[PDB]
RNA sequence: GGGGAGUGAAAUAGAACCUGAAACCGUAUGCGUACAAGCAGUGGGAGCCUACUUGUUAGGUGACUGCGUACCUUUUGUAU
RNA sequence: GGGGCUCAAACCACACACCGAAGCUGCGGGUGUCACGUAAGUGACGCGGUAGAGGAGCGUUCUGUAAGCCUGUGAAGGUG
């Protein structure tokens, strides 16, 4: 045991893939969201 | 690698055809196959590697059926109106010889090339050709 | 943790402009017009690593042509010797065996006019 | 031996500079001279003021003579604009530049 | 004297010293190699032509290096569809110097 | 009217290569041995072999 | 405003002063370019010029030629 | 499409060749899946792609590892 030696166990963290980082990333341009109408604006929910 | 022709030692030769009743479009396509140099065996497309041909009798050249009184020759002078045409037997009267240039021109290339491919065709109109010192040779008897 | 991106977009912007070295104008030098012209120069050299395949294709079989011509045989009659014949030798070496070594051209042509089919 | 002059901001521009230092670039020194002496632009008075300086810089910090010497290299770059404004019509203002430039001349014996 | 030989599912015109790169064939530096594949030998003017091939045949030359060629690079673009897609490739060669080919 | 696409700095140049000045006629009084313009009063006043100003 | 000389480890640290990028504008040099038509590249490719060592290299230029109507967004679809 | 073609370079039949795609085959290249392999290991079928789902990564700045390691015999940065 080493502090520089520590790491937990595969598929206990996951990289939290970030939307929108250029068309490579595969949530490229608009992040999952589609295309126009109301799910891609902002506050773009539908009420329960 | 592959062979590509070179246009420093390029061997060319000297040709007379004679049009002497022959058609004329299955004679130009002969010419301008020589032109191009589509009969060696080193042929290479952007090298001039064509021969020189002249042709002697470009007057009695042939245009079967009846495309002699037809077969317009149509130019545009760029003003407006400025469509003008010719036939085979007054053009061939007029300048015998701009009838078998015309043909071969437009079945080489639309290039450079072409355009210097052209320039080893020398066309006569006579039975006899300048060029005597060259000693070009017969072909297509 | 705020990061400062002043680095990486040079050394980003500079790899996009040395590919697009040589090229005309605003091509070579400004960013914008450099990143178009050096993915179009990729999109080309993909597409003619496929042309030069066949343009070579074409230009061995129009030189044995013209060889072939020069022995009293078109190509086609050449290459068909050998489904019935088997040379299995190909454009690539014909065509330059036609140009340099022609006395074993003309003995190629001979065993295809040996054929006869 | 090769000695040069700058002259860091003149208050021309430098395509109205550039357009005199073409007819200099080469010559003999004597016959530059001559050449801007007789000329009718600005920029052939203020490049006439540095080929004299570089001249007297070979003479003075080397052991040069004026007839030995030959217009060497001589290049006008761009220098700091000023920017100010001058008033148009409808309210409108436009931005002036007013361009300045660094006239370097080089001599030589060669 | 030249010879034809098919190595890497294609073929070379051959000559008795000639440095050539052919696709990756599975043998060490420095050792000799086995194709029966000879099509054409011509030495002067006695030109020997495959009937299917010259028989008689072994490809068994000597390598001189395993290397790897240059770089291409691939770049797969559909415009105004958010597509891009690079790649680069450097293919194996083995170079082998001409000594031995029946 | 203007532009639809600026000019390039080739074309910007090509059309200042008429833009190159011209050089002077100039000559040399036997009198005193200097440069003046042909044609031309001295800068120290001769013309032709003689002091005018 | 410079050319020296001094100062300093350094003045292309000289006061608009550490580093000093890119657009943009120059000078020098090598090669190309004034009978050739278009996304300006890419496949092929001669010649010429530099370094080197052998040549079946390395860098520059690219005559000539095949194919080739930018990019984003929006759309059933855009060289548009 | 142009040149141009008239016992055809047109039309109608038939025969035999050939060319022609990124198709197919030859040859060299990861793991995508799956089955086998006491897990070295080869096999077999795949591998165009928008919206979109899944899986794996690179690089930047900061903190711990770090009072470590490198560095004025030359860091970061900049240009090759």
């Given at each position: 045991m080493q502090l520089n030696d520590l790491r937990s166990?595969?598929?206990?963290?996951?990289?939290?893939?970030?939307?929108?980082?250029?068309?490579?990333?595969?949530?490229?341009?608009?992040?999952?969201?589609?295309?126009?109408?109301?799910?891609?604006?902002?506050?773009?929910?539908?009420?329960? | 690698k592959t062979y590509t022709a070179k246009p420093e030692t390029v061997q060319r030769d000297w040709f007379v055809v004679d049009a002497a009743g022959q058609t004329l479009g299955r004679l130009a396509?002969?010419?301008?196959?020589r032109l191009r140099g589509k009969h060696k065996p080193e042929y290479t497309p952007h090298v001039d590697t064509g021969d020189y041909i002249v042709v002697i009798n470009a007057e009695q050249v042939r245009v079967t059926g009846a495309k002699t009184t037809d077969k317009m020759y149509y130019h545009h002078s760029g003003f407006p109106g400025g469509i003008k045409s010719i036939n085979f037997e007054k053009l061939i009267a007029k300048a015998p010889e701009r009838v078998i240039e015309t043909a071969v021109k437009g079945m080489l290339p639309k290039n450079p090339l072409g355009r210097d491919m052209?320039?080893?065709?020398?066309?006569?109109?006579?039975?006899?050709?300048?060029?005597?010192?060259?000693?070009?040779?017969?072909?297509?008897? | 943790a705020r990061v400062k991106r002043g680095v990486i977009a040079r050394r980003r912007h500079k790899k996009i402009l040395k590919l697009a070295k040589g090229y005309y104008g605003a091509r070579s030098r400004?960013?914008?017009?450099?990143?178009?012209?050096?993915?179009?120069?990729?999109?080309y050299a993909y597409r003619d690593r496929r042309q030069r395949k066949r343009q070579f294709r074409a230009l061995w079989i129009a030189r044995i042509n013209a060889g072939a011509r020069q022995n009293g045989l078109s190509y086609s009659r050449l290459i068909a010797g050998l489904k019935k014949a088997a040379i299995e030798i190909d454009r690539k070496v014909l065509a330059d065996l036609a140009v340099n070594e022609k006395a074993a051209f003309t003995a190629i042509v001979e065993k295809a006019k040996a054929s006869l089919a | 031996?090769?000695?040069?002059?700058?002259?860091?901001?003149?208050?021309?521009?430098?395509?109205?500079?550039?357009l005199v230092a073409d007819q200099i670039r080469g010559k003999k020194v004597g016959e530059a001279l001559n050449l801007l002496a007789f000329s009718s632009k600005k920029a052939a008075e203020i490049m006439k003021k540095v080929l004299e300086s570089a001249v007297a810089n070979a003479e003075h910090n080397e052991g040069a003579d004026v007839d030995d010497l030959k217009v060497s290299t001589v290049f006008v770059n761009e220098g700091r604009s000023l920017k100010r404004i001058m008033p148009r019509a409808k309210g409108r203002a436009d931005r002036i530049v007013k361009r300045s430039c660094h006239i370097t001349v080089k001599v030589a014996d060669k | 004297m030249y010879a034809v030989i098919v190595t890497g599912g294609k073929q070379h015109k051959v000559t008795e010293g000639e440095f050539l790169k052919v696709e990756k064939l599975d043998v060490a530096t420095g050792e000799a190699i086995d194709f029966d594949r000879v099509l054409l030998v011509a030495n002067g003017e006695d030109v020997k032509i495959g009937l299917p091939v010259v028989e008689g045949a072994k490809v068994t030359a000597e390598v001189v290096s395993h290397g790897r060629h240059d770089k291409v690079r691939i770049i797969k673009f559909r415009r105004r569809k958010h597509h891009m897609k690079r790649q680069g490739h450097r293919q194996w060669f083995t170079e082998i110097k001409i000594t031995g080919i029946q | 009217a203007v532009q639809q696409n600026k000019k390039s700095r080739s074309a910007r140049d090509m059309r200042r290569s008429h833009?190159?000045?011209?050089?002077?006629?100039?000559?040399?009084?036997?009198?005193?041995?200097?440069?003046?313009?042909?044609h031309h009063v001295s800068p120290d006043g001769f013309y032709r072999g003689r002091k005018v100003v």
């Open positions: 166990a595969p598929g206990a963290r996951r990289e939290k893939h970030r939307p929108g980082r250029g068309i490579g990333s595969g949530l490229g341009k608009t992040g999952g969201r589609g295309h126009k109408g109301l799910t891609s604006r902002s506050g773009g929910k539908v009420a329960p | 396509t002969e010419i301008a196959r052209y320039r080893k065709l020398k066309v006569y109109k006579g039975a006899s050709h300048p060029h005597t010192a060259q000693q070009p040779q017969e072909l297509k008897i | 400004v960013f914008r017009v450099a990143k178009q012209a050096v993915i179009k120069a990729g999109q | 031996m090769e000695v040069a002059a700058k002259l860091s901001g003149a208050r021309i521009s430098a395509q109205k500079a550039r | - | 833009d190159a000045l011209e050089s002077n006629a100039l000559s040399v009084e036997k009198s005193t041995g200097e440069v003046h313009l042909r």
